[PDB]
Amino acid sequence: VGFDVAARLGTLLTAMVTPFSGDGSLDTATAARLANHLVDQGCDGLVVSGTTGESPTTTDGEKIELLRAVLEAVGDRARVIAGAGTYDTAHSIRLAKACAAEGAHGLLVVTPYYSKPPQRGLQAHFTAVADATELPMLLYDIPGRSAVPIEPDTIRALASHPNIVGVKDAKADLHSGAQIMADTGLAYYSGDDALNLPWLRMGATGFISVIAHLAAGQLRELLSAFGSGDIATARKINIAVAPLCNAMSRLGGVTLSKAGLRLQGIDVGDPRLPQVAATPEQIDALAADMRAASVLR
Amino acid sequence: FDVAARLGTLLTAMVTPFSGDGSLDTATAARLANHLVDQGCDGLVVSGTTGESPTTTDGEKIELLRAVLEAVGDRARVIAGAGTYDTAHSIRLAKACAAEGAHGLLVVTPYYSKPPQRGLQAHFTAVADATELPMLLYDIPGRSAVPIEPDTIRALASHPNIVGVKDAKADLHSGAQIMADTGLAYYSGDDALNLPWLRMGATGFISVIAHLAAGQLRELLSAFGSGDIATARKINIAVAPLCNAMSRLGGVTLSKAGLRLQGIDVGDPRLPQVAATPEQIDALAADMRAASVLR
Numbered sequence: 001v002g003f004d005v006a007a008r009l010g011t012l013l014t015a016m017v018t019p020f021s022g023d024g025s026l027d028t029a030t031a032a033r034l035a036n037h038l039v040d041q042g043c044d045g046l047v048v049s050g051t052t053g054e055s056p057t058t059t060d061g062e063k064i065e066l067l068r069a070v071l072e073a074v075g076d077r078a079r080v081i082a083g084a085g086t087y088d089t090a091h092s093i094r095l096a097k098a099c100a101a102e103g104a105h106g107l108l109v110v111t112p113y114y115s116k117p118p119q120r121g122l123q124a125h126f127t128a129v130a131d132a133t134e135l136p137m138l139l140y141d142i143p144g145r146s147a148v149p150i151e152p153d154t155i156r157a158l159a160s161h162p163n164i165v166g167v168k169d170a171k172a173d174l175h176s177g178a179q180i181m182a183d184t185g186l187a188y189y190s191g192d193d194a195l196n197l198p199w200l201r202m203g204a205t206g207f208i209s210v211i212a213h214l215a216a217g218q219l220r221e222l223l224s225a226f227g228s229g230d231i232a233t234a235r236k237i238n239i240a241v242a243p244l245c246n247a248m249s250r251l252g253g254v255t256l257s258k259a260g261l262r263l264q265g266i267d268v269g270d271p272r273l274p275q276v277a278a279t280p281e282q283i284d285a286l287a288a289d290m291r292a293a294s295v296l297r
Numbered sequence: 298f299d300v301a302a303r304l305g306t307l308l309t310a311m312v313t314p315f316s317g318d319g320s321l322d323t324a325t326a327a328r329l330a331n332h333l334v335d336q337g338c339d340g341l342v343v344s345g346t347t348g349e350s351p352t353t354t355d356g357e358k359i360e361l362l363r364a365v366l367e368a369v370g371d372r373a374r375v376i377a378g379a380g381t382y383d384t385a386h387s388i389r390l391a392k393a394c395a396a397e398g399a400h401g402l403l404v405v406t407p408y409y410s411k412p413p414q415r416g417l418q419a420h421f422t423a424v425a426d427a428t429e430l431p432m433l434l435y436d437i438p439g440r441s442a443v444p445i446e447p448d449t450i451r452a453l454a455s456h457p458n459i460v461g462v463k464d465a466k467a468d469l470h471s472g473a474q475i476m477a478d479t480g481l482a483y484y485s486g487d488d489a490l491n492l493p494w495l496r497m498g499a500t501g502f503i504s505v506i507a508h509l510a511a512g513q514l515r516e517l518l519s520a521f522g523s524g525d526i527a528t529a530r531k532i533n534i535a536v537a538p539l540c541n542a543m544s545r546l547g548g549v550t551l552s553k554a555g556l557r558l559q560g561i562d563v564g565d566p567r568l569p570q571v572a573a574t575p576e577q578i579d580a581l582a583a584d585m586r587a588a589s590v591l592r
Contacts, residue, residue: 056382056410087351089568113409114440115351116547117569125569145409145442252411273384274412274420 005165005187009106010045010079011206012220014038014213015052017257018066020269026062028069030268035073042220043212045079047108052210052253055083057272064098071103085109089125093132100133107137108168113146119154130163137163142170152176159184168208178202194245197238200226210253211244214260214295243289251278259286263296300460300482303431304401305340305374306501307515309333309508310347312552313361315564321357325563327368334373337515338507341365342403344378347505347548352567355390362397380405384420388427395428402432403463406441414449425458432458437465447471454479463503473497489540492533495521505548506539509555509590538587546573554581558591
């Protein structure tokens, strides 16, 4: 009875990178190969064109092409959530309709960045995007990038929308999130790998993860031990993958994910400017972290 | 290169007028542009933050640039906002603005995605290489979520097309030292710091409150220019009530609402920005009357 967010949206999702070819164009063959690899390693959902998928530097056309290719590769067996939010409500609406019509399983909608709308602007924005399609929708709260939080009262007001079902949380408000989950029934996903385990303690449904690019099997094991009550094993795994969160703070998710995947034998090309490929020295520093975390020989 | 002549000293980050249904209103853009220059602006920035660059299309940005160049380009400098978080997009938009006849470019730090400094360096170089227009960096970590660090600005200072900085970072003495070291022109990108920026050697203001108080800011620049800092301080305090309202509303909501209160209807913001509420408009009218820009 009731809408089961864990089953309908997933528990381990990667915010998948968008592969580009040598010339910079979208590489759907590799997007498909990567999607199969991440699901095979233990992800039960994927987010396409989130932040780590370089949503700022791809077109709507590329976003929809990518989504098509990923639904084709894994959509039968994993949930495919489409990133659709920007700082432009009219545009987010259009993009959310296009992803829905393409067959997406849910939407991930970021707080409008840069322009710093007031909370009632955010409420109006998220509501409008939620009214656009039948897709289950996740708010994406990340004041570190967007410059404004989704305030607790805004989240509460938004919980009454029939389509808004959860939050990807990168605000590290663990105490408030636990109370919001308790009061509203919203599903929280960790949107910061360094807080995967603390979020689980608070009631989080799962992870929308960057480091699952490299360590999806270990994060699967982590979720699986945590969910059974073997917190001790979950904590052990979390400690073991810490060098990846260290490399994350050095490089940021886009640089890290594309360079680590290449180190792991899955070349997904380089990022589009202003994002940058890791330098040779950063690649060597990255490799040492991946070895330490047991995701590279 | 004469930055003051070529880019101006008093500029407004002009709002983008919309008609009642929300579409671009170029005839109102033209009138507003004329009113602003009349009041004392010797330049205008189009499609800045205050011009709602986030919610307008490239198409609307070009139409707007054309309307304002046509309206005032003969007597004021027209600077085109061409920065986004996408280098290939910023390149095309810069070329588009150049091809229409923009006098200069304003290029914000890539927002949201937080590229590293070496990525910023690559981004600004590539944009500055796309056209022969003089370009200003627009450093606003409060919005973009990363600053342009001073070593990065010093590196970019050697690009022949990069002539200055719209500084919304509040690094006064560090900006003063860069100005002295490099010859880069600084403009205040914060009304709350307009006078301190002048004392640091800034060339002028790319202002929000100039929508409502250009004449007073023109007099502040003149009084500073003639070394009458007492008067400049007096004028600074006189207009500070507009900063009270800006803090409550933000620039976009404040500029559209305030203009409408002065008899220049420029329509509302586009979502996720919002029109001021009735009670907000009353509290704004109080602030405007306190700043003497409303009867």
